[PDB]
Amino acid sequence: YPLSMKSDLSVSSAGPISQFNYKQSFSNPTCLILATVPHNLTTITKPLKYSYINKCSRLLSDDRTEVPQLVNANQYSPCVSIVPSTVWEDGDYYRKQLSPLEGGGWLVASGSTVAMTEQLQMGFGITVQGP
């Protein structure tokens, strides 16, 4: 997680990170740490680029109605099945036909990319219930 969209990574935020990427439980204490690995830890390998999902919605069987698919707390987004591990390019879009048993229609996902930094910046969402 690069620092440039810090405002999106907040508990009281309505950004795409909350909607379709990462939402936390409201009944348990949760800290968020935005950190960077400047030079020391070479064991951490930087990825190709930062990626996130800015749209995760389902098309109904009428091909006209779109229902957003919000990810629940401590769960994976339903759109990760078609979104690759790293989004290839900014504004990429993916479609998947839905079987009638699953509800019919289509599943549509949209991913965006953020360029790399010199030092890898990461985020920690840490949820809770000495010598």
Q: State the residue for tokens 């968020």.
A: 32
Neighbouring CB atoms inside 10 A of 112's CB total: 16
Check residue 83 and report its DSSP letter.
S
Structure tokens of 21? 């990427």
List the alpha helices (DSSP H) in 1-131: 16
Coil, helix or strand at residue 115: coil
Residues 6+ apart with CB under 8 A from 1: 9, 34, 50, 121, 122, 123
Farthest-apart Cα atoms in the chain, separation: 62
Neighbouring CB atoms inside 10 A of 72's CB total: 10
Facing residues of 120 across strands? 37
Report the Cα 52 to chain-centroid distance in Å. 5
| Angle CA 37–39–85, to nearest 5 | 50
**Contact predicate 112/56, CB 8 Å:** no
| Structure resolution, Å | 3.4
Facing residues of 106 across strands? 59, 97
- Binning the chain into helix, strand and coil, the percentages to the nearest 5 are 10, 35, 55
Structure tokens of 38? 């400047």
CA distance linking residue 7 with residue 15, whole number of Å:
8
Least Cα distance to 23 among 73, 86, 75, 81 occurs for 73
**Contact predicate 84/1, CB 8 Å:** no
